[PDB]
Model the fold of this input.
Amino acid sequence: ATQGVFTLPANTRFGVTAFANSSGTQTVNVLVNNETAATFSGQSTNNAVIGTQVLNSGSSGKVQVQVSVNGRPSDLVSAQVILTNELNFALVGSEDGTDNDYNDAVVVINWPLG
Amino acid sequence: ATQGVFTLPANTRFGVTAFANSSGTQTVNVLVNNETAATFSGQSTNNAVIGTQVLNSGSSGKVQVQVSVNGRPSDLVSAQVILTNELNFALVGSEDGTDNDYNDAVVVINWPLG
Amino acid sequence: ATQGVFTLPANTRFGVTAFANSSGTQTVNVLVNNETAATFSGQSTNNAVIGTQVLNSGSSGKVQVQVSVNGRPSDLVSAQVILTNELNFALVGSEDGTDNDYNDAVVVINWPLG
Amino acid sequence: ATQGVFTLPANTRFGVTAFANSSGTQTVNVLVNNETAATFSGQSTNNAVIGTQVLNSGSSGKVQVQVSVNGRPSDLVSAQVILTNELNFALVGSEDGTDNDYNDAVVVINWPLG
Ligand SMILES: [Ca+2]
Ligand SMILES: [Ca+2]
Ligand SMILES: [Ca+2]
Ligand SMILES: [Ca+2]
Ligand SMILES: [Ca+2]
Ligand SMILES: [Ca+2]
Ligand SMILES: [Ca+2]
Ligand SMILES: [Ca+2]
Done:
């Protein structure tokens, strides 16, 4: 099943933050309405934040996270969680190799902001 | 129900990151085995990542997130989600006012790291 | 924070199922548009399905779950999770006593159906 | 990533319930310790419970859900959610066709029971 794709409410600001846990350099691309709106790159085996940004979901509200490591897309796992029917988390884990810890690049999308 | 309390596997590194979205100055305290292990604070209505740190769950694996704003504990909401039976996110939202967006201080705990 | 309240898409069919795990007889009320649309009662310490129905979210999409034992409201905990940006689960747990297992009445709402 | 596989606490009772939403007859196999522990079969386009049972996670605590329609394995999506650090839901969605509503066979695993 498709992972890393989320439908947010339209024209809504949301935060996107990426963490790295891998010997491999992580490149995280955040697409909004099918266009790259943010790119974070970094290498850490210590959950370092390799990037954070606030984006607008645009008219489509379509947000997609892609993670690439050593020239190959990482396998993605994701889910959206909603707390108290108001607070949203779009979560992404990714696996760049074979140990399947899926934390190589961890991406958290959260909204609403403000 | 109690919120903001999570049982992690013992002696396990986890990341804890806080985001602020409120005119109110947020103060986030992270307790491990009931002892403060990290404290973050900030004032942003634009999802500033006011703090991130790597902690160890210790022998108890007990982790608790507390949030206060100008001397008042905020109301918390939380849940834990596990993806592909490997990646864990312990999520916390908090409300310091009356609009109930519960994003005033948002805390994300993730493990495993590395 | 308010729990057991979910905003589903309007006029959408959804399933609501309740399980009991308590010495006490559970009463589960499912409210749509603030009106009781389904009610289940029963006692089991073996996860019996005391009720499962398909209801339509109506024009507002507002769905609320209430759990009480012989008239005494139980404490609720809830969250919503969406898988592959399509499959929705609204989850409710409830505590009617002191042990805090919050499984006295467990309610799961899922959509889309069909 | 693998889906439908969950690690429950060892030797713990849990409930597993399957709902069907498809013209195809759904077969859900629940394995514990990699051995079939339960199997449900039914057809419904109205979220009917095609099976519900209480099982024990056994020594490994490993529980896997597999879904097949017409002898073909459905694609699965899943996640585990924990509320108030006590109540667990291991959720599974499955797709037997091309519309990708992933609700053809929905399986809900919950614990603790009692
Ligand atoms: Ca890895
Ligand atoms: Ca890793
Ligand atoms: Ca607020
Ligand atoms: Ca706010
Ligand atoms: Ca109880
Ligand atoms: Ca109970
Ligand atoms: Ca389908
Ligand atoms: Ca279907």
Notes: Chain B touches chain A through 33 residues (CB under 8 Å).
